[PDB]
Amino acid sequence: LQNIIYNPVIPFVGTIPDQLDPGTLIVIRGHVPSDADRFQVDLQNGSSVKPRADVAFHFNPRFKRAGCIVCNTLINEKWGREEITYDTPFKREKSFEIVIMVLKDKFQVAVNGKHTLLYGHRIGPEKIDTLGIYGKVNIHSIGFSFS
């Protein structure tokens, strides 16, 4: 992997060091604490706090009861329609590997070496330049694979 970031402070907000062309991989390895309610991985257009940067891809594992993964897009500080994946592999007190692959018309996400979900592009992925990681999660490493 390229441009690796080890043991970042959460919340992490960092520039993705190259364009998100088809085939680009974002590999995030980490662990969910015992008391975690949720965390999120956001692919953003910039890092503006106010107004809040558009989030092309909001990937949001939630842990109450059986848990889920909520996926959405934030444009001009307005959330779109949620896409909820109920078959979640994430668990409190367990380590994980997230691999986000950028395809032409969608993201594909695999967790722990297994397909988890697809998310169709609502913003052009060329506009994404920032990776945000927020909430109750411990991130061990962030890596990128570009062409």
Ligand X SMILES: CC(=O)N[C@@H]1[C@@H](O[C@@H]2O[C@H](CO)[C@H](O)[C@H](O)[C@H]2O)[C@H](O)[C@@H](CO)O[C@H]1O
Give the dihedral of Cα atoms 16, 111, 39, 70; nearest 10 deg: 100
Stretch that binds Cl ion, among 56-64, 98-106, 123-131, 136-144 (CB under 5 A): 56-64
Question: Does 72 help bind ligand X (rule: CB under 6 A)?
Answer: yes
CB 55 to ligand X: min, Å: 9
* CB of 82 vs ligand X, minimal distance in Å: 5
- CB nearer to ligand X: give 24 or 62: 62
At residue 135, what is the residue type? G
The CA radius of gyration of the chain, in Å to the nearest whole number, is: 14
Within 57-116, which residues bind Cl ion (CB under 5 A)? 64-65
Q: Which of residues 21-60 bind ligand X (CB under 6 A)?
A: 58, 60
DSSP string for 56-123: EEEEEEE-STT-EEEEEEEETTEE---EEE------TT-EEEEEEEE-SSEEEEEETTEEEEEEE-SS
Query: Dmax over Cα atoms in the chain, in whole Å?
Result: 40
The residue ranges that bind ligand X (CB under 6 A) are 58, 60, 70, 72, 79, 82
The residue ranges that bind Cl ion (CB under 5 A) are 64-65
